[PDB]
Design an enzyme around this catalytic site. Structure first.
Site, mmCIF file in Angstrom:
data_model
loop_
_atom_site.group_PDB
_atom_site.id
_atom_site.type_symbol
_atom_site.label_atom_id
_atom_site.label_comp_id
_atom_site.label_asym_id
_atom_site.label_seq_id
_atom_site.Cartn_x
_atom_site.Cartn_y
_atom_site.Cartn_z
ATOM 1 N N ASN A 27 0.790 -1.257 0.000
ATOM 2 C CA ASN A 27 0.000 0.000 0.000
ATOM 3 C C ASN A 27 0.805 1.281 0.000
ATOM 4 O O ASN A 27 1.095 1.752 1.067
ATOM 5 C CB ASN A 27 -0.957 0.057 1.217
ATOM 6 C CG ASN A 27 -2.134 1.014 0.980
ATOM 7 O OD1 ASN A 27 -2.062 1.939 0.122
ATOM 8 N ND2 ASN A 27 -3.241 0.783 1.701
ATOM 9 N N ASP B 250 -4.181 -15.679 -19.340
ATOM 10 C CA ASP B 250 -5.021 -16.335 -18.413
ATOM 11 C C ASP B 250 -6.035 -17.293 -19.109
ATOM 12 O O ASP B 250 -6.577 -16.980 -20.239
ATOM 13 C CB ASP B 250 -5.709 -15.250 -17.617
ATOM 14 C CG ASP B 250 -6.781 -15.796 -16.687
ATOM 15 O OD1 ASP B 250 -7.991 -15.703 -17.030
ATOM 16 O OD2 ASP B 250 -6.391 -16.322 -15.618
ATOM 17 N N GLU C 166 -1.192 -19.710 -19.382
ATOM 18 C CA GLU C 166 -1.600 -20.333 -18.134
ATOM 19 C C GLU C 166 -2.450 -21.537 -18.477
ATOM 20 O O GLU C 166 -3.720 -21.493 -18.621
ATOM 21 C CB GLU C 166 -2.405 -19.359 -17.329
ATOM 22 C CG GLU C 166 -2.601 -19.875 -15.977
ATOM 23 C CD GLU C 166 -4.036 -19.925 -15.635
ATOM 24 O OE1 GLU C 166 -4.265 -20.286 -14.494
ATOM 25 O OE2 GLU C 166 -4.927 -19.649 -16.497
ATOM 26 N N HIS D 32 -1.287 -17.610 -6.853
ATOM 27 C CA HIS D 32 -2.472 -17.053 -6.272
ATOM 28 C C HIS D 32 -3.688 -17.986 -6.257
ATOM 29 O O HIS D 32 -4.696 -17.670 -5.576
ATOM 30 C CB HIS D 32 -2.810 -15.774 -6.921
ATOM 31 C CG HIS D 32 -3.067 -15.864 -8.385
ATOM 32 N ND1 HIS D 32 -2.164 -16.426 -9.289
ATOM 33 C CD2 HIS D 32 -4.057 -15.299 -9.131
ATOM 34 C CE1 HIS D 32 -2.641 -16.265 -10.516
ATOM 35 N NE2 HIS D 32 -3.795 -15.591 -10.444
ATOM 36 N N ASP D 33 -3.552 -19.164 -6.922
ATOM 37 C CA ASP D 33 -4.580 -20.184 -7.017
ATOM 38 C C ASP D 33 -4.179 -21.403 -6.202
ATOM 39 O O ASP D 33 -4.674 -22.518 -6.457
ATOM 40 C CB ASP D 33 -4.765 -20.563 -8.485
ATOM 41 C CG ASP D 33 -5.389 -19.408 -9.325
ATOM 42 O OD1 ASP D 33 -6.096 -18.553 -8.714
ATOM 43 O OD2 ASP D 33 -5.225 -19.383 -10.598
ATOM 44 N N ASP E 26 -6.160 -20.155 -2.092
ATOM 45 C CA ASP E 26 -6.990 -18.987 -2.365
ATOM 46 C C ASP E 26 -8.277 -18.948 -1.497
ATOM 47 O O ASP E 26 -9.125 -19.834 -1.595
ATOM 48 C CB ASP E 26 -7.419 -19.101 -3.791
ATOM 49 C CG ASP E 26 -8.290 -17.953 -4.199
ATOM 50 O OD1 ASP E 26 -8.192 -17.018 -3.404
ATOM 51 O OD2 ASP E 26 -9.022 -17.935 -5.274
#
Ligand SMILES: C[C@H]1O[C@H](O[C@H]2[C@H](O)[C@@H](O)[C@@H](O)O[C@@H]2CO)[C@H](O)[C@@H](O)[C@@H]1N[C@H]1C=C(CO)[C@@H](O[C@H]2O[C@H](CO)[C@@H](O[C@H]3O[C@H](CO)[C@@H](O)[C@H](O)[C@H]3O)[C@H](O)[C@H]2O)[C@H](O)[C@H]1O
Ligand SMILES: [Ca+2]
Length: 585
Positions: free
Chosen positions: A143, A325, A354, A420-421, A465
């Site tokens: 952030n 993707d 992917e 991330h999966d 996830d």
């Protein structure tokens, strides 16, 4: 010998060009059946009287059931025909060709590689051969701009547990700010998860392909990012979500509004009007019933021209290539033209699909440069994390996977541990650090391109996830610096030892019993030999090292010097210890 196990085909992974005048060929045979594989070859139009050329095929590997043989054909004419001479351990000889088997050369016939076209030589960008890649899931990395934080942003703390709809405020200004950390780690590219305008934390249901999502920044911040990364030797790869749009995409909103008056109805897969039933969508979506993600009709030339326009747009911002993707659910024509376009704008733009299964059909040279090698990850998991397989299955799984594609592909496959999966790789190791570092050592030394998932380098855990997407730990104290210096050190070795970025791999020792696996990277005369003691106790091994490969090695991690008496190297490893042995060349 078993002819039912003998295989070759004059295309795909079994026969393919490495330049315009040389063909690589491979044959597979029951493990043990052949001891000598020779190629007898000639121009396709050679007169029946000219002598054959010879090329003797070394054994490039073996898996559970097969041996694989590999040869290089020199084809000045660029048009080859050939026949294999296989020899069994007792000196049985048989000729293997297109027509079949026979003790008579003639009766075997000849496979033919009709013509090598310069444009058909698989060629990938050079920087990718020797890259290390870092995956950033922007919503949770850093952030740096609190003013653009989404509503209901939870707090960025050492052990928040994210829910499917959470926000922590990670944005682009935070990447910019953390670039020194990245550069210090030694990474040379960044793989961004999607960053285009979308209303979600993953942004895979795109509202607008042509805009930075407002809570990630704006285009000036992005450009500031591309340059800032570039001046630190870091490339930028973006996540192209072309299989499906989000339910806010202009054209689809048109569709929800105008039903079958929409100029955009054939851009989607609409089962019947009005478009919308929720828990029952009447349109095809990614996966099953995912109303935010209607499938795009990429076969539609209009849909295709539009995504091509997207790809151009971002490529004018100077990014360095694409991660595709759900790529295996958009058509091949799309992907061939996508490459023609992409490579035309930037010969060095990388293209990575992917796909989780056997991607052999997108890796022949006319579509993707590479994929996220989830296969690689499977073997890694079941070998150092769960321990389902011992060292000799591991070797088979590695090799068999290695032979699946042309070398040009396997050289830069993205070899990850997790994403991330996925659950985090420390987690798959039930938190066992020692097994984790061995999997990292393996990753940082094996054939292909290492992918780091933000956080692994300093110890982050998590189930799958959305738990594998926690906010990145930034407090020095809260981070495994020991692990961080480890990645750093491994990454610099990879940069110094050409062998690790460019050499080939051959299995060197594999003992199901000790669970001690070793392999050898070679480029030119450089040999680097890596040994893995993936066992809870401490063991000794005698590695067969002939006098030819050198007889003195230097252990790169420790500095220890090691010596071979009599074609042999005696080595004592500590529990879960690995050595990286440079043959000094
Ligand atoms: C996740 C994965 O599924 C297959 O992956 C299968 C695979 O085909 C099969 O071989 C076997 O290995 O299992 C895998 C299961 O992961 C695909 O073939 C593969 O291409 C895809 N990965 C990409 C595509 C989606 C959509 O854009 C993205 O998810 C994005 O949108 C999804 C839409 O609801 C979100 O998940 C949501 O629905 C999923 C479907 O079961 C759930 O598993 C998940 O827990 C839930 O949160 C996700 O959080 C978001 O990041 C994702 O992040 C991106 O990497
Ligand atoms: Ca923010």
């Amino acid at each position: 010998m078993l002819l039912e196990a003998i295989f070759h085909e004059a295309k795909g992974s079994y026969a393919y060009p490495i330049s315009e005048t040389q063909l690589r060929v491979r044959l597979r045979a029951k493990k043990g059946d052949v001891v000598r594989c020779e190629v007898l070859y000639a121009d396709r139009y050679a007169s029946p009287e000219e002598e054959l050329a010879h090329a003797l095929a070394g054994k490039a590997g073996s898996d559970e059931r097969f041996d694989y043989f590999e040869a290089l054909l020199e084809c000045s004419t660029k048009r080859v025909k050939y026949v294999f001479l296989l020899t069994g351990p007792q000196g049985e000889a048989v000729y293997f060709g297109e027509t079949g088997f026979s003790a008579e050369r003639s009766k075997a016939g000849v496979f033919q590689y009709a013509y090598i076209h310069r444009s058909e030589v698989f060629t990938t960008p050079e920087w990718a051969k020797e890259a290390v890649i870092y995956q950033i899931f922007p919503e949770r990395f850093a952030n740096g701009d609190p003013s653009n934080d989404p509503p209901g942003t939870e707090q960025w703390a050492k052990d928040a547990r994210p829910r499917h709809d959470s926000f922590y405020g990670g944005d682009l200004k935070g990447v910019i700010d953390r670039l020194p950390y990245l550069e210090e780690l030694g990474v040379t590219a960044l793989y961004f998860t999607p960053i285009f305008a979308s209303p979600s934390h993953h942004k895979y249901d795109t509202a607008d392909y042509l805009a930075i999502d407002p809570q990630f920044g704006d285009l000036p911040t992005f450009r500031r990012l591309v340059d800032e990364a570039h001046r630190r030797g870091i490339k930028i790869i973006l996540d192209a979500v072309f299989n499906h749009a989000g339910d806010q995409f202009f054209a689809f909103r048109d569709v929800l509004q105008k039903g079958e008056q929409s100029r955009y109805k054939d851009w989607f897969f609409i089962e019947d009007f009005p478009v919308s039933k929720t828990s029952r969508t009447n349109y095809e979506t990614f996966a099953v019933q995912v109303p935010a993600m209607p499938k795009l009709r990429t076969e539609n030339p209009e849909v295709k021209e539009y995504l091509f326009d997207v790809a151009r747009f971002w490529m004018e911002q100077g990014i360095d290539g694409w991660r595709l993707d759900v790529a295996n659910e958009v058509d091949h024509a799309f992907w061939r033209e996508f490459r023609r376009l992409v490579k035309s704008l930037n010969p060095d733009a990388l293209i990575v699909g992917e796909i989780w299964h056997d991607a052999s059909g997108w890796l022949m040279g006319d579509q993707f440069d590479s994929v996220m090698n989830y296969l690689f990850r499977e073997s890694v998991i079941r070998f150092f994390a769960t321990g389902e397989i011992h060292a000799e299955r591991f070797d088979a799984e590695l090799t068999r996977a290695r032979m699946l594609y042309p070398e040009q592909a396997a050289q830069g496959l993205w070899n990850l541990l997790d994403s991330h999966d996925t659950e985090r790789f420390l987690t798959s190791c039930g938190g066992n650090e020692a097994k984790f570092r061995l999997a990292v050592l393996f990753q940082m030394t094996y054939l292909g391109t290492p992918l780091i998932y933000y956080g692994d380098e300093i110890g982050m855990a998590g189930a799958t996830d959305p738990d594998c997407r926690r906010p990145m730990i930034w407090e020095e104290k809260e981070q495994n610096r020991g692990l961080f210096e480890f990645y750093k050190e491994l990454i610099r070795l990879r940069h110094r030892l050409a062998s690790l970025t460019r050499g080939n791999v051959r299995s060197w020792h594999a003992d199901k019993q000790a669970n001690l696996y070793a392999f050898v990277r070679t480029v030119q005369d450089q040999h680097v030999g890596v040994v893995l003691n993936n066992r809870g106790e401490k063991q000794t091994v005698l590695l067969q090292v002939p006098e030819s490969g050198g007889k003195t090695w230097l252990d790169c991690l420790t500095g220890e010097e090691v010596h071979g008496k009599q074609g042999q190297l005696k080595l004592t490893l500590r529990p879960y210890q690995g050595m990286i042995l440079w043959n000094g060349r």
